[PDB]
């Protein structure tokens, strides 16, 4: 009961997905072969949420891997946990998208997409009560942005009543990796606005800051960064996988955190986060976790929560904890930091608690905030788009893939409207 379907689209998305799978298999006591070697019966009770049971006491991720390039697939198959994935669930093209949203959405990814659709239909037919979909990808490239957008459009067309969740890698301001990133982000964000029910805005710059400042990590690799994201992902759906004292799944979270249809862009966070040295000089207690989570410098989106207000915040706690203590701490934070919370939604905080902690830790926390500061992310992007579009820079490539200028105009308008709406509700 309550099966989730996982989709990974483009290189970054795939990489994050791999990490996610690795963590979750470890959590549920699943080895690199698909066999359960755990101790606790609780690890297998709700195994069906993320895994299909294959013949001979093995488990396989309900995961679809998508890319316009084959190399990524190979890399995944050769990596840790590569062999756990169903071979028929790898759907790859041969060409690539060349950082072009149009290639991914209209041309190459369109040719690709039917196969993917066929796979995912089958995957849906298998599960008895599919609750919905989780897509991991980035809005800065071509394959990852276009393919994902087309697929989510198709899944909202065929599954309009199911929950649609995305974990995106938003383009940061300073660390600009590509030149057409503004275009790709703009086009994809628009589509996300209409077709996702909740969107977790993850930002590389913020991750780097976390790694450098909070973990004090000498050399971050993408894997390390990805780990953080994976942890966050695991946090959200802990209530579907384990028992607890107060239980909240994907739907319950959405209903409590989304007051208006369009405002479904979250700034996620995780706690605790310490170095090796600073591990000894700390208190493993709920007050400390709470303190950590609400800090601006612990957000995985490059936005200052102190530049806006929290519309709603959901906190998900894992480990053996006193409910009273949890409640006290959340009330204290809202009373003390009154100015950071919208005053016309009393009790801006939703709490959920799962008894089963993550491995290595006795207590852990996951944060989901709907903050009006997310407007900053959109605004910058809009500005950059304007700067490009005013001089029609790089437009020709997109137009060569069948795209028309008017779409760009529309998307930009839409994003502007969204920004305005956030501002006004602040």
């Amino acid at each position: 009961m309550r099966e989730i379907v996982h989709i990974q689209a483009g290189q970054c998305g795939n990489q994050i997905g791999a990490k996610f799978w690795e963590v979750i298999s470890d959590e549920h006591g699943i080895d690199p072969t698909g066999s359960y070697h755990g101790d606790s019966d609780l690890q297998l009770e709700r195994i069906n949420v993320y895994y299909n049971e294959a013949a001979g006491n093995k488990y396989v991720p309900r995961a679809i891997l998508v890319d316009l390039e084959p190399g990524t697939m190979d890399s995944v198959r050769s990596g840790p946990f590569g062999q756990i994935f169903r071979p028929d669930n790898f759907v790859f093209g041969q060409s690539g998208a060349g950082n072009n949203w149009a290639k991914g959405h209209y041309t190459e990814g369109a040719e690709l997409v039917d196969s993917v659709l066929d796979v995912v239909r089958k995957e849906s037919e298998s599960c008895d009560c599919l609750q919905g979909f989780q897509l991991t990808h980035s809005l800065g490239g071509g394959t990852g942005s276009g393919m994902g957008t087309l697929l989510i459009s198709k899944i909202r067309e065929e599954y309009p009543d199911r929950i649609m969740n995305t974990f995106s890698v938003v383009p940061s301001p300073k660390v600009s990796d590509t030149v057409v990133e503004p275009y790709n982000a703009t086009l994809s964000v628009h589509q996300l606005v209409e077709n996702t029910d909740e969107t977790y805005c993850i930002d590389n710059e913020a991750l780097y800051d976390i790694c450098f400042r909070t973990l004090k990590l000498t050399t971050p690799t993408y894997g390390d960064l990805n780990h953080l994201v994976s942890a966050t992902m695991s946090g959200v759906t802990t209530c579907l996988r384990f028992p607890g004292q107060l239980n909240a799944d994907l739907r319950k979270l959405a209903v409590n955190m989304v007051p208006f249809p369009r405002l479904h862009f979250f700034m996620p966070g995780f706690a605790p986060l310490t170095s090796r040295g600073s591990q000894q000089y700390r208190a493993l207690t709920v007050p400390e976790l709470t303190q950590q989570m609400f800090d601006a410098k612990n957000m995985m989106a490059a936005c200052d929560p102190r530049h806006g207000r929290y519309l709603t915040v959901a906190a998900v706690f894992r480990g053996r904890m006193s409910m009273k203590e949890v409640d006290e701490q959340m009330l204290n934070v809202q009373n003390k930091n009154s100015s950071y919370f919208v005053e016309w939604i009393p009790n801006n905080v939703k709490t959920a608690v799962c008894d089963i902690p993550p491995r290595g830790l006795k207590m852990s926390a996951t944060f989901i905030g709907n903050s009006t500061a997310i407007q900053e992310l959109f605004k910058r992007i809009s500005e950059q788009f304007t700067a490009m579009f005013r001089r029609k820079a790089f437009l020709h490539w997109y137009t060569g893939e069948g795209m028309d200028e008017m779409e760009f105009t529309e998307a930009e308008s839409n994003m502007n409207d969204l920004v305005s709406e956030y501002q006004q509700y602040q």
Binding site: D161, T409, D417, L418, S420, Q424
Partner: protein, 308 residues
């Protein structure tokens, strides 16, 4: 700034079923501008039509000024309004042998057009069904469902919609009835026409006008396919209706200076051009006199006081 949305109430006649139940007259009209719901909660409007009001009376005392504004170069929109069973399709389309304001409008509109034509007119009729946020072309159903597209200077065009440049009442009347035969109410019956006029002196600068007249058979509030339709329908009914409340704040000219939520639905986004335009608007609430409908008459009217 304001949309000048007049609000009139039309009380449909008590049905034989309501009479057989023995329901009494929950609606008591106090004045042409005021009704009470029976005890006697007050509701206030620009005009109230009783159970015997004709299709011609509805036209003359509620939409004639909107139709006129359109022939004169303005936009205008009629939103029939209420719960399911309210009385909207009958008021708007009716039946071919017992037509709604659609016909009363075409007859008045075309007499004015034929007179003024002495300015060439192109009466660009269109008719769409908004169903699960998709837009059915009801005049050319071979195109199935269409999307909404912002335009240079961001008004909205239904992508690739078929329009007919009519010249008479009968052409639009037959066009529309056919369009209703092509419908699913499970949808918002958005009927609209562009009353376009170009200086008969075509060799002169053609400073044209494009008046817009629109009347909607809004899907009513409903309390797996039908559950979804209900859901989508009720959600859009709350979205457009609360975009109306935002328009009221705007129209009031109060401190709530923001962007109205027209983007919350395809219904509203398309209606946007007339909702906040150089226009006159009208809501025609449709209610029942029966005690049996009190929940319906109570909620439909509550909204109407807020819209007004």
């Amino acid at each position: 700034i304001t949309y000048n949305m007049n609000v009139v109430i039309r009380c449909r006649p008590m049905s034989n079923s309501e009479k057989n139940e023995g329901a009494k007259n929950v609606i008591k009209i106090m004045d042409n501008k005021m009704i009470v719901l029976l005890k006697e909660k007050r509701y206030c409007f620009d005009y109230v039509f009783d159970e015997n009001s004709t299709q011609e009376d509805v036209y003359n005392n509620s939409v004639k000024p909107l139709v006129d504004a359109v022939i004169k170069g303005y936009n205008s929109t009629v939103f029939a309004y209420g719960a399911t069973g309210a009385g909207k399709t009958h008021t708007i389309i009716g039946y071919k042998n017992e037509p709604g304001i659609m016909m009363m409008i075409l007859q008045d509109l075309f007499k004015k057009i034929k007179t003024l034509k002495a300015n060439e007119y192109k009466i660009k009729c269109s008719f769409i069904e908004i169903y699960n946020e998709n837009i059915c072309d009801l005049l050319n159903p071979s195109s199935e469902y269409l999307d909404l597209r912002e335009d240079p200077v961001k008004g909205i065009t239904v992508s690739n919609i078929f329009e007919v440049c009519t010249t008479s009442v009968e052409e639009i009347m037959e066009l529309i009835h056919t369009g209703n035969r092509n419908r699913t109410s499970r949808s918002h019956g958005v009927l609209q026409v562009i009353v376009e006029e170009t200086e008969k002196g075509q060799g002169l600068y053609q400073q044209t006008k494009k008046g817009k007249l629109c009347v909607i058979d809004l899907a009513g509030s409903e309390r797996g396919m039908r559950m979804l339709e209900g859901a989508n329908i009720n959600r859009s009914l709350l979205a457009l209706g609360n975009v109306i409340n935002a328009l009221v704040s705007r129209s009031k000219g109060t401190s709530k200076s923001n962007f109205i939520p027209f983007r919350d639905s395809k219904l509203t986004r398309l209606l946007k051009d007339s909702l906040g335009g150089n226009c006159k608007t009208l809501m025609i609430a449709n209610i029942s006199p029966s005690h049996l409908s009190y929940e319906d008459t109570h909620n439909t009217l509550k909204y109407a006081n807020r819209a007004k």
